[model samples]
Structure formats: C-alpha cells, structure tokens
Target: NAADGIFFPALEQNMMGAVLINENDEVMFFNPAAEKLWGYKREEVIGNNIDMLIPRDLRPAHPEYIRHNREGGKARVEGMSRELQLEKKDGSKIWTRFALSKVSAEGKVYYLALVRDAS
Candidate 1:
C-alpha cells in the first residue's frame, strides 16, 4: 500500500513525486506532484506498468530490480543517495533521485518509489 491523498498532503510542500506499483507492476497511485514530474496525466499512467516510465534501456532491467528488491537482495539507494534517469512521457529522460521501498499489507506487496528531480 502507498500513501493515500489524505496522508500525502505533505507532498505539496516539497515538489516531490510519489508512485506506488502493485505486485503486478501496475501503477496504482500517484500524486499531483507525479503528474508534474513525469509530464503525464493520471489517465496516461494508472494501470500501466511502472516500467512504462523507465527509460527504454533501463526498463528491461526494472523487473529484475523489483524481483531482487522483493527478495530483499537489491540495493536501491545504496552507497549514499544516488542519481538515476527516468523516462518522461515525451520519450525524454530526466535525472532524479530514485528511492525505492517495498510495503506489504495482508500478504500483498507493493512498491513505493519516491522521485525527485535532482537538479
């Protein structure tokens, strides 16, 4: 599960974009900050694979990343905060600090990806 709107009003204060992806890799939720960050409307991304927002080359590697993370084996932000490239709707990529976390609820798991333009 991810932060619901009522719980994420704080996002408005910092220009941070948040995305929640279900175990199926479907994008379940995002904030206005996300739409602003990805240049994509909610309609364009909801129910879409979170990978759709990843750069083409990196997209292929995402599933492995998720799988590894789910197994508690991958290091998302290891060795200090790192930089990453995320794909925008227009097929362009932007630099961002990609922090990833996994949450489980009632035996179901999900991913919460916190994205911020690293500019």
Candidate 2:
C-alpha cells in the first residue's frame, strides 16, 4: 500500500491546492491545502460533488462544462491555465489561478485541477 502510505500524504501536504475528480464530478482526492483554501475539512469534501467549491452563481454551469468536455466536446480550458473566482465553504470568494488536465487510468477518465491563490 505504498500509494496509501505515501502518495495520499504527499498530495495532502502539498503547498498548492490540488483536486482530483472523476468525470462524473465526484472528488477523488481533496488535498489539505485545497481544503483550507475552500474552507472545508478532508472528511467533509472527499467523495463529494466538486460543485461545493464553486460559487452558487456559477454552479449551474460548472457541471455542464465538465460533462461537455468529458464527452469529446471542445475544450474551453484544457492545456491552459486561467484565473477564476472560487467560492469558499463560508460563502466567501477568492481569486485563484487554475489549470485543468485530463488523465485516464484503469479505463476511467479523471480531471485533475491545480489551483493557487492569486491574492
């Protein structure tokens, strides 16, 4: 269980916010830095919908964007990094730089996001 022993903690203690999610928008990995940035605890976020980190105003469209690209649709932000205003659990907002990347393993599609506070 090298992965369970080392990999998870490495991501957990990472300096920047890191999120790994399945194509269905479920959070597979939610790092501590990310949890802190979003004002969420590890137990509160893992296996949860990623939309909790998105602002209410943008939540409606976030899943659609993820779904569209997962189905071979055009990419709006793939292979590129952009800045966005993300929401914290307390309903506050923070400006963060985000990058989206797609990965496939075990015949499943996953999206990994790296985020850094811009402020």
Candidate 3:
C-alpha cells in the first residue's frame, strides 16, 4: 500500500534528527536533520558503525550493548526519551534528547533513533 511509503518522506523532511541502524550497528539511514545535528555528511556515516557518533570514552561499551539488545537481552531504554551527549564529526559534543525504538522485519532487527537538540 502507498500508506507505508508515506512515512519515508515525512522522516526525510522532519526537523528532528532520525537515524536507523541495522543489527550490526551499522547505519542504514541517516537523515539530513541528523547530518546537521551531528555535523556529518550522510556519505560519511552511512554503512559505518554508529560508534563514530559516540564519544571516545563511551565508545567501547556501545557495541556490546547493541549486541546484547539485538540478541534479545532486556532493553532498558526502548521507547523512552533520555538526555545524552553526542559527538560530532569535528569532535565537538552537544546534549540531545534521544529516544530509541526496536524494529523487526522478516526476522531481522533494526534500531531507530529520534534526536532533538537539547543544547
């Protein structure tokens, strides 16, 4: 149905940042709003590990956490909006309000995050 196709256009045009990563923690969709918020070009982040957007100090545990959640571990933050810091491409940080959701399709998992600048 065309109804399902409508969401992408809304997502792409949204003012809030949107990011979608696969089970491997590799980015699949990084919207323009995300680019502006994170100071990264879409080409630079797509297909790359999302850890690149995490601060160096917090990077080590991120993948393990993702792996745990993907493997069916309890999700502590799903459906909640929390405050966190995001590292930009130039190594600058900004506070953002973030919410994450889990998506499953055909037995595969994906993570979708919506972000708002809280700085």
**Which candidate leads the pack in TM-score?**
3
RMSD of each: 3.8, 2.7, 2.7
List the candidate numbers ranked by lDDT, top first. Answer: 3, 2, 1
TM-scores, in order shown? 0.79, 0.85, 0.88
Model 2: lDDT to the true structure: 0.81
For residues 71-111, what per-residue lDDT tens digits would candidate 3 score against the true structure? 66454346567998888878888999998888877777888
Number of the top lDDT candidate: 3
* Runs with alpha carbons beyond 4 Å of true place in candidate 1: 1-8, 11-14, 72-81
Candidate 3 global lDDT: 0.84
Candidate 1 global CA lDDT score: 0.75
Writing each residue's lDDT as its tens digit, candidate 2 over 1-119 gives: 65669777776688888899886788988887897788988888888888887799998888887776777734433556899998888878889998878877787778888888899
Candidate 3 Cα outliers beyond 4 Å, as residue runs? 1-4, 73-79
| Clashes (candidate 2) | 0
lDDT of each: 0.75, 0.81, 0.84
